[PDB]
Amino acid sequence: KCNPNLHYWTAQEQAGIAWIPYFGPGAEGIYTEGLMHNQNALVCGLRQLANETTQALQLFLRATTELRTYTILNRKAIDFLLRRWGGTCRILGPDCCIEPHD
Amino acid sequence: KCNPNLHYWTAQEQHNAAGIAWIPYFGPGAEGIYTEGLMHNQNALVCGLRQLANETTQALQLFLRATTELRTYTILNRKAIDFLLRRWGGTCRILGPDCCIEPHD
Amino acid sequence: KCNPNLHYWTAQEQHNAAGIAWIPYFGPGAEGIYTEGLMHNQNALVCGLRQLANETTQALQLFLRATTELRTYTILNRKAIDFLLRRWGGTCRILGPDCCIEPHD
Amino acid sequence: SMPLGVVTNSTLEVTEIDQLVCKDHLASTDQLKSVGLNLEGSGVSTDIPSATKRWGFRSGVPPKVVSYEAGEWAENCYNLEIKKPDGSECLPPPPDGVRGFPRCRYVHKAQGTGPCPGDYAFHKDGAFFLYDRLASTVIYRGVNFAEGVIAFLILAKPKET
Amino acid sequence: SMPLGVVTNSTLEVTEIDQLVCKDHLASTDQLKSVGLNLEGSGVSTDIPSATKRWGFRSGVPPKVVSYEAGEWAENCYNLEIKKPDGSECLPPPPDGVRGFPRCRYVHKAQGTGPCPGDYAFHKDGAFFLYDRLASTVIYRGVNFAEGVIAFLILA
Amino acid sequence: SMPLGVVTNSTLEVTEIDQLVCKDHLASTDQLKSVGLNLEGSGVSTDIPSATKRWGFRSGVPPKVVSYEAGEWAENCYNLEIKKPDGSECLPPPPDGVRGFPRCRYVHKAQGTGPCPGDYAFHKDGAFFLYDRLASTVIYRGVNFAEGVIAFLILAK
Amino acid sequence: LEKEYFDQHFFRTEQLIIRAPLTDKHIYQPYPSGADVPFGPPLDIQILHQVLDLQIAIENITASYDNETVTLQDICLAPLNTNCTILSVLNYFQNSHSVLDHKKGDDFFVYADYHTHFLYCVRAPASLNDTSLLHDPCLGTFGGPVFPWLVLGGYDDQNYNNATALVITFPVNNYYNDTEKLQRAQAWEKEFINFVKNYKNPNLTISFT
Amino acid sequence: LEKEYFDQHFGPFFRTEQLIIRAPLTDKHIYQPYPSGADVPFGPPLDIQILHQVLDLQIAIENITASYDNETVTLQDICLAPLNTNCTILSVLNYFQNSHSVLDHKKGDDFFVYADYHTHFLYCVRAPASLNDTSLLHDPCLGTFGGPVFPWLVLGGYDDQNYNNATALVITFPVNNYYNDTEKLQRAQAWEKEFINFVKNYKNPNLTISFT
Question: Where are the annotated segments for Receptor binding (chain D)?
Answer without folding.
Answer: 2-154
